[PDB]
Amino acid sequence: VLSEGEWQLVLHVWAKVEADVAGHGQDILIRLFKSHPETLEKFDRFKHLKTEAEMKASEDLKKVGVTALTALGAILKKKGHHEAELKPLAQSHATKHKIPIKYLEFISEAIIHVLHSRHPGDFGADAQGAMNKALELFRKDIAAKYKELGYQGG
Numbered sequence: 001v002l003s004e005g006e007w008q009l010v011l012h013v014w015a016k017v018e019a020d021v022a023g024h025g026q027d028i029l030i031r032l033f034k035s036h037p038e039t040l041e042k043f044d045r046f047k048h049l050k051t052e053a054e055m056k057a058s059e060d061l062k063k064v065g066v067t068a069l070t071a072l073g074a075i076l077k078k079k080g081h082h083e084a085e086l087k088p089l090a091q092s093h094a095t096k097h098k099i100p101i102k103y104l105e106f107i108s109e110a111i112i113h114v115l116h117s118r119h120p121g122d123f124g125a126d127a128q129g130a131m132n133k134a135l136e137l138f139r140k141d142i143a144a145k146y147k148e149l150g151y152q153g154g
């Protein structure tokens with residue numbers, strides 16, 4: 001789907017994420033909750049975290065962020081060959097957590113924002129476009145899996 005050069009840009013910036021998965025995951029979740037506060041309602045154990053500093057101090061939140069970014073990294077490394085990795089994620093996020101596709105758009109925005117904030121010299125326009133395409137492919141394929149399970153994801 002993406003060109004080889006596009007995948008290389010995606011995986012180059014992902015290697016920078018991997019130097020500090022925990023910190024990237026914290027910043028991505030905090031940015032998501034600040035930009036789109038409705039998303040915080042999906043995390044029952046985070047509702048007592050009232051400030052950014054409380055969110056950064058929560059080992060629970062940090063672990064959730066690492067788990068999410070670890071799954072996303074494993075998907076990105078498949079360079080589109082990710083049906084086997086997406087099926088359980090779709091099942092879980094559609095049927096258990098009830099995450100609309102729009103919320104996956106929101107977290108994608110947060111991912112792009114944090115990656116550019118931390119790695120501008122390794123995440124210029126071409127790399128941003130490549131990452132946007134990779135996350136778009138992720139969302140398109142997961143939306144198809146949602147439907148297969150009986151969830152439109154709207």
Ligand code: HEM
Nearest residue numbers: 039042043064067068069071072092093097099103104107
């Ligand atoms: C790049 C997009 C995402 C990835 C790769 C991802 C990945 C994961 C993984 C691997 C887990 C643990 C296994 C599971 O329960 O499925 C998880 C848990 C969870 N996810 Fe996501 N997720 C993403 C986006 C979201 C978004 C946008 C939301 C809500 C707005 C969300 C809500 C949740 C919740 C509520 C849990 C349970 C956490 C817990 O109680 O430990 N996810 N996610």
